[PDB]
Design a protein around this ligand. Sequence first.
Ligand SMILES: [Zn+2]
Lengths: 324, 48
Amino acid sequence: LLSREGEIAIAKRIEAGRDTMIRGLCESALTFEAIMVWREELGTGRILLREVIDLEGTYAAINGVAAQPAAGAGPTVSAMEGELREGVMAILDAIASEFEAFRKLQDKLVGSRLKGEDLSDADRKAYEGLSATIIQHLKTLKLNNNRIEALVEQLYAINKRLIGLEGRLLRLADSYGISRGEFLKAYFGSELNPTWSEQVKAMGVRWTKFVENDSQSVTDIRSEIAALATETGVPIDDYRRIVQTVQKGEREARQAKKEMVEANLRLVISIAKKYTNRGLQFLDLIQEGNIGLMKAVDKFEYRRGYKFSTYATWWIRQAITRSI
Amino acid sequence: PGSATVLTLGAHMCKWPIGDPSSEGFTFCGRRSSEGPYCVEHARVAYQ
Ligand SMILES: [Zn+2]
């Protein structure tokens, strides 16, 4: 069903969605703490190269060919790792340095908001630059899909805790007769403001009663919230935006991938037919084949000109065989 | 050079990518989509 141009278009949408995800993720301190831990665990053999990066994709990128399953003369997983390790460590190293630089301005920005003011125009432009170069760099690292998904999960988890704390504040305000709209307009954007409770008092008797009579709960929740802002190295409203950014990119990538899998079902089937009596049901063969297809999609590099279906066949086949 | 980025890419808008995703000037077509991710023109390019 897909032309070569359709295959490319899908690859590009996946890559763009992924980039949007990374773009959002790189604003959070946690994503780079995670990458620092992975650097650590690699350096000490706690984890293997293959769990951090897309091993076959990276190795294929050495000669600009198609990614293929690891091993009769082809390279084993250990072989690929041996070829790639030094370069991956070098990149993680360079990135560590750029993260430190970036995190200094993160702390500057969060602290600045905590005092009420904002980053100097220079410190801010520097922030922008660092962000850009870091996103590009991380792109050259070719992270494992599971690692990116782990980052996304962590980000969203934080967001769930935030939404909980805001829910509490919301009903609290409600009991003093402050509507959702009234509250959210008074609250969005000022989550780090130290003089918030004193400033909202000026909004009248309901607000005054709210933050004086129930000052305890209020200051507690706002403390917890502020702790999220600390745990992620960004102000709360920024975190809101990051989360939406990542969700958007994620949905684009997911949809593009889905389209690609659907469009290559026929291929999957035609491979499943060759493995009918080998112990598994036809539908099982299909689903496994699809796991393999999805892997081919994850590792597909359109820029290198190789035909998608014949490449995908290796991964489909590997998934089927392994299940058997 | 279309009228959308990933962020601004609304629904029923054409998801046809223009340029290199690594490029700062990367865009999507973003014209009215019809039965799928793509306008008729880009659907034609994308399929068969
Ligand atoms: Zn179009």
